[PDB]
Amino acid sequence: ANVVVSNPRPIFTESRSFKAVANGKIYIGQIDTDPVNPANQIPVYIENEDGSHVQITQPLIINAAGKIVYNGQLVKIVTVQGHSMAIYDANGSQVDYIANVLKYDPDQYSIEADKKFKYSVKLSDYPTLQDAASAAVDGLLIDRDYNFYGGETVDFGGKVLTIECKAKFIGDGNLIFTKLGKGSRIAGVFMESTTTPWVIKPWTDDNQWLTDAAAVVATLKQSKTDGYQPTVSDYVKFPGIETLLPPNAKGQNITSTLEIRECIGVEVHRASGLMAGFLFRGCHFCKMVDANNPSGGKDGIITFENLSGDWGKGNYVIGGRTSYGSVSSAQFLRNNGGFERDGGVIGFTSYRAGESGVKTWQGTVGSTTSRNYNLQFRDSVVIYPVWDGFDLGADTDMNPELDRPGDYPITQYPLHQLPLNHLIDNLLVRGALGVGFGMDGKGMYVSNITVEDCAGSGAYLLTHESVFTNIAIIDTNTKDFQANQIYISGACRVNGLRLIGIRSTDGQGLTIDAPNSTVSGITGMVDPSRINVANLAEEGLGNIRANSFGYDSAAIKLRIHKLSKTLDSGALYSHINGGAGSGSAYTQLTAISGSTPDAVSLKVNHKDCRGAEIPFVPDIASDDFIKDSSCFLPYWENNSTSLKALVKKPNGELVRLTLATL
Amino acid sequence: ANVVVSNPRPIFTESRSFKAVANGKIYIGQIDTDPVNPANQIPVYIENEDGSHVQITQPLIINAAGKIVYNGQLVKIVTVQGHSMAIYDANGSQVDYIANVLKYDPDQYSIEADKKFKYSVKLSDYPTLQDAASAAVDGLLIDRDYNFYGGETVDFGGKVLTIECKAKFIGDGNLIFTKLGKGSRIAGVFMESTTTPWVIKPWTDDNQWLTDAAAVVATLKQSKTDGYQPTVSDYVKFPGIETLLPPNAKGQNITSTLEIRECIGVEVHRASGLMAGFLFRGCHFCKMVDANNPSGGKDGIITFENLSGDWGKGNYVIGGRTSYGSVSSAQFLRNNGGFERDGGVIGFTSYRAGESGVKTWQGTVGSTTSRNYNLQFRDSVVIYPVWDGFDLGADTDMNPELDRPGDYPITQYPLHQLPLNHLIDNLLVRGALGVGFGMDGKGMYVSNITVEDCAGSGAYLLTHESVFTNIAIIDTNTKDFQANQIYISGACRVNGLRLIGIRSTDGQGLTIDAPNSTVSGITGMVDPSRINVANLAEEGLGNIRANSFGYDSAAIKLRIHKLSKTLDSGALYSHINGGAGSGSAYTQLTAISGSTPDAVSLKVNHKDCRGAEIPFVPDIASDDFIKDSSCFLPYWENNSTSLKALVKKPNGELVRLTLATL
Amino acid sequence: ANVVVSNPRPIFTESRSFKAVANGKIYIGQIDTDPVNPANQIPVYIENEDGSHVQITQPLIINAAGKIVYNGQLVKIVTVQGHSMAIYDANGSQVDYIANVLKYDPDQYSIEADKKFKYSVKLSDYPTLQDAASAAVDGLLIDRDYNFYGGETVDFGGKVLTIECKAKFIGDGNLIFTKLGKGSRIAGVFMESTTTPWVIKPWTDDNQWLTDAAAVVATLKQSKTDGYQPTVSDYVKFPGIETLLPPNAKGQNITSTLEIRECIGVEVHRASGLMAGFLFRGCHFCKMVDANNPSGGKDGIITFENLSGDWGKGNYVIGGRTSYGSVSSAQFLRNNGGFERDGGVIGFTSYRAGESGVKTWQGTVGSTTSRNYNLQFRDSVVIYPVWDGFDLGADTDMNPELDRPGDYPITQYPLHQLPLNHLIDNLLVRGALGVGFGMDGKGMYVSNITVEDCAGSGAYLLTHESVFTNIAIIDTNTKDFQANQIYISGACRVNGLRLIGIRSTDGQGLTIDAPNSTVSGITGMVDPSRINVANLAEEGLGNIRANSFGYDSAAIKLRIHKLSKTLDSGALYSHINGGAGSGSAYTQLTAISGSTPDAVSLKVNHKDCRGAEIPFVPDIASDDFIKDSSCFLPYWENNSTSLKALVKKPNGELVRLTLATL
């Protein structure tokens, strides 16, 4: 096509007559210079049958047939590209002084065009993608939908390519890119499944989920988007949705993925597709930049697998608008950030998600540890995940089997106590039907978080001696399913926690459940009955000022929480003494009595009385009712009608006196 | 010099004598092998003048002049790749054999340049932008500055072409990229305007706003930037500007718009300019990624108008940095993001927006409605707007009622009670001369807001049954014009709210005026004389410390807002029994009296007395002052000069009983 | 050794025999024509060795040997357009005739290729970067490792290029790009250093920072990553390094920054490079969106040296994940961003900053100011910076000798009083070994910060008259022995502070040390004996339920921080009676005496008696002990073995009355 079969051994003839210069001489030197000078002489190399290139002295001979002959026979001499010439015949005359042989090409426009135009092969001109890849030198360009061959391999000779995609990759397999340089920029990638699979739509037209098998089935239709494939979790939580699905629409693996195994820093930019997916394997410093709504399929839409080989330092998901799918939206296997928290999602957003919107695989795959450490999950978002929320936790394996094959053994770090030490901040969730988080770790910290309306638990934090700051769990668990709104199974210091919102628990389930954790700054109207924290204290409030709006009194009270859940304990209300629309009020220190609240009172300035209302024991009082020296207690006796008042002697003993006499 | 004359038809000769092969044979085959057995053979083609390549019977023939000959006439044979040549003479002896040879044909360079080069068209060599767009295939460049006339429609077609703009589209008219292809990109546009308009600069040279109507007129300067052209709204924000403002500055329309119609998603990266506009008429999935301070003109800087046809979803303003303009920046219009919140303002920074920061339009523009639903307004900023930092309002109108045509019958949803489902987070506002925040809707879950310094009302929320959180309203109404720093008309429920910073003011009206909401957790300082909520009760918190620094006494200070909300109801507050280190401090429980606080009180440990101090009625007590049983009311008898005790017998009848005697 | 030596001069031999075409003739004509016609003959030029193209007559001649000839001398005959050779022998006969020597018309095709391809010049073709820049119109590409000399000043002539870098850009010192056009898009640059310097790393394998000189010196090694070069300031963090540091590593100044001199809007893009750094000098409206872990050298990784000339508006640092360094990672020097807060930092992510993750070079350099106003720091994060975190101070710490040379006179704004109007929201730090969030200024409104674990200080604030919000300094000062967790010297106001996390304030000093601040609702488990603010008035709180979960009582431990800010000043306990669940508890109003908490208690309902146990002075009462105009004080009289009542008449005449005679 582009190679000529021509005279392989060159012919050098005499200029003034039609004869070859026997015992002639050829010198090769620098461009536009005398080549007779030994210094100007440039290397001139043989090419024997073994591919060697051995230098030889410059005065190359020309035999009596026009070819060039070494001390033996013909040889295929070789110089670099820019070789000058100087023919000298035996006698000493000259024949030629070709200055720059490269200027003698039959078409010397290419020598200039090649140097002032950008190189980019377009796939339309080629029959196979691999053939186009084998020709690209600067950047490929796709101008035609490619029907990829169910998992074909495409090795780009380890080049650096600024691939631009302007057409789909129709197919139902896994196009695999390999051996790309440390500059690749595959962008505009679009993968569409060649097969339209059966999908389910557990939600309805009013944002309200469905946890009923019959309704899920009735919402079973055939289309590439607006749904997802049934998966293991779907018949894990939905009650018996094995028995209501035809085999053909059950356990299929329709998907289209762009696997880029074994590459470093290929920088996948804007990506899209229907039933798409992007599975990086054995990558490092390989980030995926904002992707415009890749509707997922049966595989993780963005899976940063790094099982084999070293860990996965440097895998990012910066930006994104991922949607739908039947398995986790953004996954992470192995992928140790190794200090620097180099990796993890940033600015990500995952609608639907048939699993956690940003999940860090737990347990182990094969015999390889699949947890994720020193990562960074910050400034992200997730909305309406079905089976699991922003599941950060690693080693969340409920099933205990044995030591972890590949990382710290449970003898050193017991499960749910690994020092994976993530970095978290500015998160968000909305409408999650599973659990808002799945965190589990030891000695890590989290920052501003908010879990808005949800149909499941708002937090499942199986941590140990961690710190949670400014958490917000507003109006979560509207389905009433569980009773563990925000659950913490380990010592923790939640501060600035937000709980019940516009929706009212109305005695449903329970709110915060951290019997091993201490929480402070719990703000919001939550019925205190349903709180089970080991400790709780607002140690630091200044000189407070309680206010009451719409009420006729200010309810300042204590409500010992171990004595009785619903029942209180002590209070110092300030009810209006006697209406006095703008007159005054009375203050009373009410205390709970026989299974009743606010029985006794120390009313002060009742009904504008300007005097106290001290209580007294209605009957005889024992000797054990005083525990403090120099104290005065009134107890009444009806028979004599006089008010006795037993007084603990400051000396320490006790005497009984008569205070008021009729 | 473009082509150098050179003879085709290479000549083959012998190796030891100059004679030329006669009737010989040339056999081609794979590298470094015997090229005679079809096992090692490589195809060889004929490249006639027409370019029609054709195969040949393998054994090449050479006439008596050492030239490849086919069918008598000389022919140029072209192989497919590298090959080993074995030239045998008519006798059959090997004239010469070679294993490796390569000489790419110099002909057919256009065929090798149509493929390996990046197609585009520089506008410098085309008369009309439409003519340049017609010839473009997969790229384009604006080298020369264009001069589009008003309404110049440009036809690109399905061409998915990257318009990398390196020049500016000067013109006070509108440029339309009609029916441009899907997946395109536009970068670096620096749109401008031929006519410099008369602008105003309502902010003084140092800072802050000139609320005076006669102050702006001085700023009238006729500069292309540093001002927003006069607008209808300017005639109601500044009272009395109708008169002084000259007619030349009235009714200006100087703006330049890159109107786009009928596209299914085109990025507009780095869309710079001044006096610019970027309307997206009837467009879907188009996102104005990034920007560079386009000092917008009179029309909205980024207006995703869609009321022509379908609802429109996927329109983003992801990223960017906008400034100036007369009408709101980044205004949406009839975009229902769907369930997945596909349209939003994720990331933004607007400066001195003429009307509003992100105003989502309200009511109905023309017959078709002009509202929005299911959009995400996530992390962003709005600096020194004029009217609204974020007018995410829907069916507001304020005055107009009737019925919204095209959204929802007023019967199904009354005024301001629209289900919008906007998700909001990480907002910010500063120096908003008007309302710094405001919307309406039945059910919205707001999150972190952190408004700050403002010269106007902090917020004007008009929702109904919605929950807010981490709302930080700091130092608003710096000019005191409005009587409310926040006004939540509906029965909302705030969940943590900051109010004052340093601009504390006793000249402002009620800072918060939500008459039916239910706030919780008002942390910042505030004059409680200002709150007007329906129920201020944050229930749930631990043991309190009630600290007081550098101040004599520390207090709890209960206050009933039914009673002289300016005066406290009086409560428990310990004082000092001497200089520091005394170790004694008397807890002084109080209770308000007629329009005077702490007139009636009960003390304990008065300056180290180690004893209580019980108040008594100075005059005679009455039954009205008592009601609870088993309690006595010490009242003084001035006549007999002794402490009587009005005792309420447990039996239910009070018997006036003497207590003390002299 | 790539090409095969070959005779370039064309030798012509007749077709049907092996003879040269003696004294023949060549006609060069138009494409696809018969050149014998005198009209079908294009101009034909000689090319000399020197390169002096000259025209000659058409009917070319051939000497006796076949080579072309002109005046008894050989020549190379070239044309400006594709031709159609026609060779005729001396006798007269068409020995051969090529319709198309090249099969295209380069002259005509040159126009089409010029106007249908994307211009660019790969550096491989050019020797010097300056030469490539001169011979480029746009889309310049770097494809070979251009090892620039210590210095390289490149003048681009004002062209608006699109420079790109697919290969390393090695060198040393500081290369200089100059005269870039308004809109360049330098992307993918990758710098390095030709010298591997001796580096240190004060962090062990567990990130437990090092401070002893011996350890840090022991870890001194030679490499480009994993460490930083010592700086003069490094002699302060670790005392004694001046003596123990070997001379070789004592002050090595190595870096590979590219100095973009005077330029406008050269948006740099993804950048990397070991020991690389970058900086802009005298440059406006430029940004460095994104980055890929550029390890720094002796100079700030992203500096903005815009000191000479006018202030540097618009110098953003959007995005990026810089790492390491020895003097800074985002330092700015002189940038007044106007009222639009233009030219700040957004979406950054530092690491192991040698001095600060973000800096503003407070003080003065040369005879010029080095402060910077009206910037914009948001959505950033700096992890484990050594000397400081978000160092944002503008005024010098203690340099009153100068008066802000070229800046607001100290008289106009005293030390640490410059109105900077910075915009700081949504930040974070972690692991800082210095100060987390240092600051200086007046009248500024920082908010929403989440400082995290950091051995050192949580924040050193010198603001005066500033408002804060949502600040969260948690578990800071890990290494202990530091002055304060947070220090706010000024009349500031703070809102929403989080303090202590899961670490114990045992060996630390005052956690909050703002002697003249007015902090609001301080939340979290902080020891109220470690706070030293001037107020905590949080007035605005609602009804509250101070419920305790673990302990056996619920307390309102009212405190006075003037008597003693350690023990207490009176409580409102409510302990349970007869164990939990019995529905019995007694309220205990109390006070302090003898420097022992709970010395006196007026407890109600002790042991479920419905009584009113009251304390009294165990001796004669004193008129001073009573101050209320109407109140009786009980006092015991062991001599009378009875209680007496110190009674004060309403007018004020003291009276004595017995209470309980026996």
Swiss-Prot record, chains A, B, C:
Its EC number is 3.2.1.-. The keyword Nucleotide-binding does not apply. GO terms for cellular component: virus tail, fiber. GO terms for biological process: adhesion receptor-mediated virion attachment to host cell; symbiont entry into host; symbiont entry into host cell via disruption of host cell envelope; symbiont entry into host cell via disruption of host cell envelope lipopolysaccharide; virion attachment to host cell. Keywords: Degradation of host cell envelope components during virus entry, Degradation of host lipopolysaccharides during virus entry, Glycosidase, Host-virus interaction, Hydrolase, Late protein, Viral attachment to host adhesion receptor, Viral attachment to host cell, Viral tail fiber protein, Viral tail protein, Virion, Virus entry into host cell. Belongs to the P22likevirus tail fiber protein family. Homotrimer. Interacts with the host O-antigen lipopolysaccharides; this interaction induces cleavage of host O-antigen. Interacts with tail hub protein gp10; this interaction anchors 6 fibers onto the tail hub hexamer. The interdigitation of the polypeptide chains at the C-termini is important to protrimer formation in the folding pathway and to thermostability of the mature protein. Structural component of the short non-contractile tail. The tail comprises six spikes that mediate primary attachment to the host cell lipopolysaccharides (LPS) and display endorhamnosidase enzymatic activity, hydrolyzing the alpha-1,3-O-glycosidic linkage between rhamnose and galactose of the O-antigen polysaccharide. Digestion of the LPS brings the capsid near the cell outer membrane. This is Tail spike protein. The lineage of its organism: Viruses, Duplodnaviria, Heunggongvirae, Uroviricota, Caudoviricetes.
